[PDB]
Amino acid sequence: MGVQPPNFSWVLPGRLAGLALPRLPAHYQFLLDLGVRHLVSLTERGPPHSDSCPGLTLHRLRIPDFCPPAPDQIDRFVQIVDEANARGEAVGVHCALGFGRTGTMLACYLVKERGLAAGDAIAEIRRLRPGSIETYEQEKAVFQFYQRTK
């Protein structure tokens, strides 16, 4: 039995989801039940109770709140999703609220998945998850990822 964590939704159904901070054993069980085997954690302090769920692998990429992921972090995130999805495993990504840091990562993955530029990728994540991508530097990070990988 799982309990859906806060602000959870699929971006790529069965492949890639965003969420706010998970914090109960049943949140992690929910992720496992939905086929998630990897949780990319962007917070400065690990989410509560993750150690109750050994079957879920956490990948901690620390990003200060209201700041963008760095290029190495974007590349690592993209690798984690590509490799997990190729193994038939889904990935979740979270921050404290699930909007800024999380939305920026999700938009970068769409740049790659759909061959989009940042305007389209950011628009799409905002359509799916209104409130996503909170700062100017977060927007610029998606743009620069596009430029590096075009």
PDB file of C-alpha atoms in Angstrom:
ATOM      1  CA  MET A   1       0.000   0.000   0.000  1.00  0.00           C
ATOM      2  CA  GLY A   2       1.270   3.442  -0.982  1.00  0.00           C
ATOM      3  CA  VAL A   3       0.168   7.029  -0.475  1.00  0.00           C
ATOM      4  CA  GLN A   4       0.675   9.494  -3.315  1.00  0.00           C
ATOM      5  CA  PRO A   5       3.326  12.054  -2.329  1.00  0.00           C
ATOM      6  CA  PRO A   6       2.510  15.770  -2.507  1.00  0.00           C
ATOM      7  CA  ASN A   7       2.493  17.553  -5.874  1.00  0.00           C
ATOM      8  CA  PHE A   8       3.062  14.292  -7.781  1.00  0.00           C
ATOM      9  CA  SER A   9       2.417  14.002 -11.493  1.00  0.00           C
ATOM     10  CA  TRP A  10       3.745  12.272 -14.560  1.00  0.00           C
ATOM     11  CA  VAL A  11       5.554  14.260 -17.235  1.00  0.00           C
ATOM     12  CA  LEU A  12       6.349  11.164 -19.359  1.00  0.00           C
ATOM     13  CA  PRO A  13       3.752   8.589 -18.238  1.00  0.00           C
ATOM     14  CA  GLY A  14       5.401   5.501 -16.728  1.00  0.00           C
ATOM     15  CA  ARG A  15       8.853   7.063 -17.225  1.00  0.00           C
ATOM     16  CA  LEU A  16       9.375  10.446 -15.516  1.00  0.00           C
ATOM     17  CA  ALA A  17       7.469  12.189 -12.691  1.00  0.00           C
ATOM     18  CA  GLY A  18       7.891  15.266 -10.527  1.00  0.00           C
ATOM     19  CA  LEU A  19       6.946  15.643  -6.863  1.00  0.00           C
ATOM     20  CA  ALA A  20       7.381  17.792  -3.780  1.00  0.00           C
ATOM     21  CA  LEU A  21       9.368  16.429  -0.837  1.00  0.00           C
ATOM     22  CA  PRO A  22       8.447  12.821  -0.004  1.00  0.00           C
ATOM     23  CA  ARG A  23       8.416  12.252   3.747  1.00  0.00           C
ATOM     24  CA  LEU A  24       6.607   9.031   4.765  1.00  0.00           C
ATOM     25  CA  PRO A  25       7.412   5.381   4.120  1.00  0.00           C
ATOM     26  CA  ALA A  26       4.126   5.043   2.201  1.00  0.00           C
ATOM     27  CA  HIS A  27       5.226   7.820  -0.231  1.00  0.00           C
ATOM     28  CA  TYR A  28       8.227   5.717  -1.259  1.00  0.00           C
ATOM     29  CA  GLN A  29       6.080   2.585  -1.486  1.00  0.00           C
ATOM     30  CA  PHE A  30       3.725   4.502  -3.815  1.00  0.00           C
ATOM     31  CA  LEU A  31       6.670   5.357  -6.057  1.00  0.00           C
ATOM     32  CA  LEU A  32       7.758   1.708  -6.139  1.00  0.00           C
ATOM     33  CA  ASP A  33       4.165   0.626  -6.911  1.00  0.00           C
ATOM     34  CA  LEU A  34       4.152   3.017  -9.912  1.00  0.00           C
ATOM     35  CA  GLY A  35       7.351   1.458 -11.247  1.00  0.00           C
ATOM     36  CA  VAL A  36       9.744   4.157 -10.043  1.00  0.00           C
ATOM     37  CA  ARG A  37      13.125   2.698  -9.077  1.00  0.00           C
ATOM     38  CA  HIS A  38      15.149   5.944  -8.962  1.00  0.00           C
ATOM     39  CA  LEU A  39      14.483   9.158  -7.083  1.00  0.00           C
ATOM     40  CA  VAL A  40      16.542  12.211  -7.989  1.00  0.00           C
ATOM     41  CA  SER A  41      16.680  14.399  -4.902  1.00  0.00           C
ATOM     42  CA  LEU A  42      17.610  18.074  -5.358  1.00  0.00           C
ATOM     43  CA  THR A  43      17.318  19.262  -1.744  1.00  0.00           C
ATOM     44  CA  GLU A  44      20.044  20.284   0.701  1.00  0.00           C
ATOM     45  CA  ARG A  45      18.799  17.813   3.344  1.00  0.00           C
ATOM     46  CA  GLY A  46      17.724  14.330   2.420  1.00  0.00           C
ATOM     47  CA  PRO A  47      14.076  13.610   2.400  1.00  0.00           C
ATOM     48  CA  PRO A  48      12.659  11.959   5.522  1.00  0.00           C
ATOM     49  CA  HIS A  49      12.292   8.181   5.692  1.00  0.00           C
ATOM     50  CA  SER A  50      14.008   7.335   2.431  1.00  0.00           C
ATOM     51  CA  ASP A  51      16.026   4.701   4.327  1.00  0.00           C
ATOM     52  CA  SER A  52      12.768   2.767   4.937  1.00  0.00           C
ATOM     53  CA  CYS A  53      12.748   1.867   1.219  1.00  0.00           C
ATOM     54  CA  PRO A  54      15.981   0.151   0.079  1.00  0.00           C
ATOM     55  CA  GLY A  55      14.438  -0.880  -3.279  1.00  0.00           C
ATOM     56  CA  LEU A  56      14.398   2.753  -4.383  1.00  0.00           C
ATOM     57  CA  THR A  57      17.780   4.245  -5.349  1.00  0.00           C
ATOM     58  CA  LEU A  58      18.247   7.901  -4.393  1.00  0.00           C
ATOM     59  CA  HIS A  59      20.497  10.170  -6.437  1.00  0.00           C
ATOM     60  CA  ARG A  60      21.287  13.291  -4.449  1.00  0.00           C
ATOM     61  CA  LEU A  61      22.239  16.260  -6.613  1.00  0.00           C
ATOM     62  CA  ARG A  62      22.327  19.192  -4.187  1.00  0.00           C
ATOM     63  CA  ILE A  63      20.979  22.447  -5.608  1.00  0.00           C
ATOM     64  CA  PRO A  64      20.481  25.481  -3.359  1.00  0.00           C
ATOM     65  CA  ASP A  65      16.823  26.523  -3.294  1.00  0.00           C
ATOM     66  CA  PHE A  66      15.942  29.187  -5.907  1.00  0.00           C
ATOM     67  CA  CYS A  67      19.065  28.300  -7.914  1.00  0.00           C
ATOM     68  CA  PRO A  68      19.514  26.397 -11.182  1.00  0.00           C
ATOM     69  CA  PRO A  69      21.024  22.954 -11.665  1.00  0.00           C
ATOM     70  CA  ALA A  70      24.582  23.174 -12.957  1.00  0.00           C
ATOM     71  CA  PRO A  71      25.512  21.638 -16.333  1.00  0.00           C
ATOM     72  CA  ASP A  72      27.016  18.484 -14.782  1.00  0.00           C
ATOM     73  CA  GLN A  73      23.828  17.987 -12.728  1.00  0.00           C
ATOM     74  CA  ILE A  74      21.577  18.331 -15.774  1.00  0.00           C
ATOM     75  CA  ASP A  75      23.758  15.808 -17.646  1.00  0.00           C
ATOM     76  CA  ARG A  76      23.693  13.353 -14.724  1.00  0.00           C
ATOM     77  CA  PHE A  77      19.885  13.676 -14.397  1.00  0.00           C
ATOM     78  CA  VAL A  78      19.421  13.040 -18.122  1.00  0.00           C
ATOM     79  CA  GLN A  79      21.691   9.968 -17.868  1.00  0.00           C
ATOM     80  CA  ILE A  80      19.744   8.590 -14.888  1.00  0.00           C
ATOM     81  CA  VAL A  81      16.399   8.934 -16.720  1.00  0.00           C
ATOM     82  CA  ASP A  82      17.742   7.560 -20.030  1.00  0.00           C
ATOM     83  CA  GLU A  83      19.321   4.517 -18.361  1.00  0.00           C
ATOM     84  CA  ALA A  84      16.443   3.768 -15.995  1.00  0.00           C
ATOM     85  CA  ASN A  85      13.838   4.095 -18.735  1.00  0.00           C
ATOM     86  CA  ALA A  86      15.901   1.750 -20.960  1.00  0.00           C
ATOM     87  CA  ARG A  87      15.671  -0.797 -18.097  1.00  0.00           C
ATOM     88  CA  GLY A  88      11.876  -0.346 -17.896  1.00  0.00           C
ATOM     89  CA  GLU A  89      12.176   1.702 -14.707  1.00  0.00           C
ATOM     90  CA  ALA A  90      10.611   5.075 -13.989  1.00  0.00           C
ATOM     91  CA  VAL A  91      12.288   8.038 -12.330  1.00  0.00           C
ATOM     92  CA  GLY A  92      10.947  10.669  -9.957  1.00  0.00           C
ATOM     93  CA  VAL A  93      12.572  14.029  -9.276  1.00  0.00           C
ATOM     94  CA  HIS A  94      11.819  16.244  -6.282  1.00  0.00           C
ATOM     95  CA  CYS A  95      12.765  19.391  -4.450  1.00  0.00           C
ATOM     96  CA  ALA A  96      11.066  20.993  -1.435  1.00  0.00           C
ATOM     97  CA  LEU A  97       7.902  22.111  -3.311  1.00  0.00           C
ATOM     98  CA  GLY A  98       8.313  20.366  -6.686  1.00  0.00           C
ATOM     99  CA  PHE A  99       8.289  23.548  -8.820  1.00  0.00           C
ATOM    100  CA  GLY A 100      11.574  25.413  -9.304  1.00  0.00           C
ATOM    101  CA  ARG A 101      14.527  23.051  -9.186  1.00  0.00           C
ATOM    102  CA  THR A 102      12.312  20.105 -10.173  1.00  0.00           C
ATOM    103  CA  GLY A 103      10.629  21.950 -13.034  1.00  0.00           C
ATOM    104  CA  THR A 104      13.987  23.059 -14.441  1.00  0.00           C
ATOM    105  CA  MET A 105      15.263  19.476 -14.547  1.00  0.00           C
ATOM    106  CA  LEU A 106      12.022  18.258 -16.127  1.00  0.00           C
ATOM    107  CA  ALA A 107      12.192  20.945 -18.831  1.00  0.00           C
ATOM    108  CA  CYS A 108      15.781  19.981 -19.672  1.00  0.00           C
ATOM    109  CA  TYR A 109      14.716  16.370 -20.133  1.00  0.00           C
ATOM    110  CA  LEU A 110      12.003  17.501 -22.590  1.00  0.00           C
ATOM    111  CA  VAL A 111      14.617  19.463 -24.554  1.00  0.00           C
ATOM    112  CA  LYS A 112      16.304  16.129 -25.137  1.00  0.00           C
ATOM    113  CA  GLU A 113      13.271  13.798 -25.339  1.00  0.00           C
ATOM    114  CA  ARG A 114      11.252  15.900 -27.802  1.00  0.00           C
ATOM    115  CA  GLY A 115      14.047  17.924 -29.449  1.00  0.00           C
ATOM    116  CA  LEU A 116      12.599  21.150 -28.102  1.00  0.00           C
ATOM    117  CA  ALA A 117      14.062  24.565 -27.442  1.00  0.00           C
ATOM    118  CA  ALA A 118      13.614  26.123 -24.023  1.00  0.00           C
ATOM    119  CA  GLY A 119      10.564  28.202 -24.898  1.00  0.00           C
ATOM    120  CA  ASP A 120       8.571  25.083 -25.780  1.00  0.00           C
ATOM    121  CA  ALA A 121      10.069  22.928 -23.020  1.00  0.00           C
ATOM    122  CA  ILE A 122       9.388  25.465 -20.266  1.00  0.00           C
ATOM    123  CA  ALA A 123       5.894  26.158 -21.633  1.00  0.00           C
ATOM    124  CA  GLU A 124       5.106  22.467 -21.563  1.00  0.00           C
ATOM    125  CA  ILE A 125       6.320  21.848 -18.020  1.00  0.00           C
ATOM    126  CA  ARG A 126       4.317  24.912 -16.897  1.00  0.00           C
ATOM    127  CA  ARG A 127       1.198  23.578 -18.654  1.00  0.00           C
ATOM    128  CA  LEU A 128       1.626  20.224 -16.920  1.00  0.00           C
ATOM    129  CA  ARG A 129       2.689  21.640 -13.543  1.00  0.00           C
ATOM    130  CA  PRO A 130       1.654  25.308 -13.217  1.00  0.00           C
ATOM    131  CA  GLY A 131       4.108  27.267 -11.105  1.00  0.00           C
ATOM    132  CA  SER A 132       7.157  25.366 -12.358  1.00  0.00           C
ATOM    133  CA  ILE A 133      10.521  27.065 -13.045  1.00  0.00           C
ATOM    134  CA  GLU A 134      10.582  29.898 -10.538  1.00  0.00           C
ATOM    135  CA  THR A 135      13.530  32.126 -11.362  1.00  0.00           C
ATOM    136  CA  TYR A 136      15.228  33.864 -14.264  1.00  0.00           C
ATOM    137  CA  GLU A 137      18.430  31.827 -13.778  1.00  0.00           C
ATOM    138  CA  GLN A 138      16.385  28.597 -13.867  1.00  0.00           C
ATOM    139  CA  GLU A 139      14.861  29.661 -17.218  1.00  0.00           C
ATOM    140  CA  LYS A 140      18.326  30.554 -18.508  1.00  0.00           C
ATOM    141  CA  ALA A 141      19.662  27.153 -17.456  1.00  0.00           C
ATOM    142  CA  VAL A 142      17.161  25.431 -19.784  1.00  0.00           C
ATOM    143  CA  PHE A 143      18.126  27.825 -22.592  1.00  0.00           C
ATOM    144  CA  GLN A 144      21.835  27.130 -22.080  1.00  0.00           C
ATOM    145  CA  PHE A 145      21.229  23.368 -22.015  1.00  0.00           C
ATOM    146  CA  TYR A 146      19.457  23.731 -25.362  1.00  0.00           C
ATOM    147  CA  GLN A 147      22.398  25.733 -26.724  1.00  0.00           C
ATOM    148  CA  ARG A 148      24.998  23.183 -25.577  1.00  0.00           C
ATOM    149  CA  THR A 149      23.133  20.204 -26.995  1.00  0.00           C
ATOM    150  CA  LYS A 150      21.520  21.596 -30.168  1.00  0.00           C
TER     151      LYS A 150
END
